Amino acid sequence: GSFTPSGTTGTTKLTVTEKCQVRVGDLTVAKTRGQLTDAAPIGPVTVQALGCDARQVALKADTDNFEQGKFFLISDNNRDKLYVNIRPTDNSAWTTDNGVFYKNDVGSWGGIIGIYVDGQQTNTPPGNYTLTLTGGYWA
Amino acid sequence: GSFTPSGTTGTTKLTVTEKCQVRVGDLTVAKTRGQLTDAAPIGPVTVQALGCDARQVALKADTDNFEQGKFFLISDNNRDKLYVNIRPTDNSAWTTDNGVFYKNDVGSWGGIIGIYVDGQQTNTPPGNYTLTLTGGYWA
Amino acid sequence: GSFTPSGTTGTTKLTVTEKCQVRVGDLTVAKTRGQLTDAAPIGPVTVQALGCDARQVALKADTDNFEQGKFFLISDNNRDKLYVNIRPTDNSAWTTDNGVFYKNDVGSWGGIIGIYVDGQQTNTPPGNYTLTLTGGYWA
Ligand SMILES: O=C(N[C@H](CO)[C@H](O)c1ccc([N+](=O)[O-])cc1)C(Cl)Cl
Ligand SMILES: O=C(N[C@H](CO)[C@H](O)c1ccc([N+](=O)[O-])cc1)C(Cl)Cl
Ligand SMILES: O=C(N[C@H](CO)[C@H](O)c1ccc([N+](=O)[O-])cc1)C(Cl)Cl
């Protein structure tokens, strides 16, 4: 049960707004709180492993993004949570262990990890939410 | 007189330099202090509102970017100001209220907000200057 | 012996990993620690000077990136160093002076500055390393 950081970082960002939504500057991922329905896709996270034929690929969430076996995006001020489910788009088997989401089998896996809203959270306060995931391997 | 944050953030950045100017890395917006003449354009800010047929679109500047009914870009160290005027490129009417720049009429407005140097400031200390504007609505 | 900041900033980033390397999200510069051999290229830094016909172009490294006439990328936590050599790809002559790398002759130089691993450092701890260089002129 140990994660070894070894890889790069993917940052999933979402700006939550009200129905009257004012987009300023370049396009970013934004949704009204009413769109935060159960299983709503937030976005994909690409994963490409190399040199892991004998290790279990893994992603570790920043400390501020997990608690009690649950993952969540966190607001800029660290106060507000948006609970999510993390799931590879393929049929591969993974396990969650204290902020770590690791593959059950060894191998240099490449694939897409989807981030989805876990439970309708249409009362989420408007703000900027982030989930940070770092590549590495588990054992 | 209340701003409700609801939208994304646009960041206007400018690096001020001397006449001998050394650009390192990728292109960014940079000017010599001698170019900071009155009404000099710093750059455009896009605004695209959705679902605001019954609200007044608004942009709020970060606390560090306004004081006394005046807006300004602020240096990285929070010390130096570059006073600017904020004005939509179209003929629409807006109002300034304590760091908030709001549209006089309701509607899902889309347009360009220009950022211009307010008063010649050719003695501005070289540094990195930023103005941050967040989308939302006023009332 | 004085650097005057006047120009923009170039940030050289490198993520060091183990042999089992898990890339998450968009492509960034990453190497296994085994690739950190002597003279290994980390990446180029573009420099384009304007209005410097009578000044010596210069780049100053952030305080956290130099000590004792040596430059280094520094880990996110400020603890770990990756010593590098900084060298223009052309035949021009430069001098190092306390975190400052300046050109020996005046002129509005444009060119590429290469960043190379200085001494094999294959035991470098996995992490994110950065070197920040700001444009200006020396005298
Ligand atoms: O954002 C996602 N999906 C969309 C549907 O809204 C779509 O299925 C999709 C799948 C893959 C993809 N990719 O691989 O880049 C992008 C979008 C899920 Cl992976 Cl969270
Ligand atoms: O940067 C601006 N303007 C330039 C002139 O220097 C030009 O008028 C312009 C107008 C619109 C624009 N846009 O819509 O992206 C970009 C440049 C002003 Cl909007 Cl501040
Ligand atoms: O990254 C570098 N070099 C590569 C070799 O790995 C190559 O020589 C190169 C040279 C110039 C260049 N550029 O000008 O953008 C990019 C790569 C050195 Cl400049 Cl550090």
DSSP chain C: --EEEEEEEEEEEEEEE-SSEEEESS---EEEGGG--TT-EEEEEEEEEES-TTSEEEEEE-GGGEETTEEEEEETTS--EEEEEEEESSS--EEEETTEEEESS-S--EEEEEEEE-S--TTPPSEEEEEEEEEEEE-
What CATH number is attached to the domain comprising C41?
A: 2.60.40.1570
Residue of minimum CA distance from atom 1 in ligand 1? A43
CB A24 within 8 A of CB B131: no
Proximal ligand: closest to the CA of B117: 2
Q: How far is B32 from chain C (nearest CA, A)?
A: 9
Q: Which residues of chain B make contact with C55, given a CB cutoff of 8 A?
A: 20
Answer yes or no: is the C-beta of C39 below 6 A from any ligand 3 atom: no
- What is the enclosing helix (H) or strand (E) of A137? strand A127-138
Experimental approach:
X-ray
Report residue A126 as tokens.
Answer: 């408007």
Domain that holds residue A100: 1-139
Total Cβ atoms within 10 A of residue C25: 19
Residue type, A86: I
For residue B83, what are the β-bridge partners? B72
- Ligand 1: does its nearest atom lie under 6 Å from the Cβ of A44? yes
Which one of C15, C16, C22, C33 would you mutate to disrupt binding with A, by most A Cβ within 10 Å of its Cβ? C22
Tally the domains of chain C.
Answer: 1
Contact C8 B25 (CB under 8 A): yes
For residue B51, the one-letter residue type is G
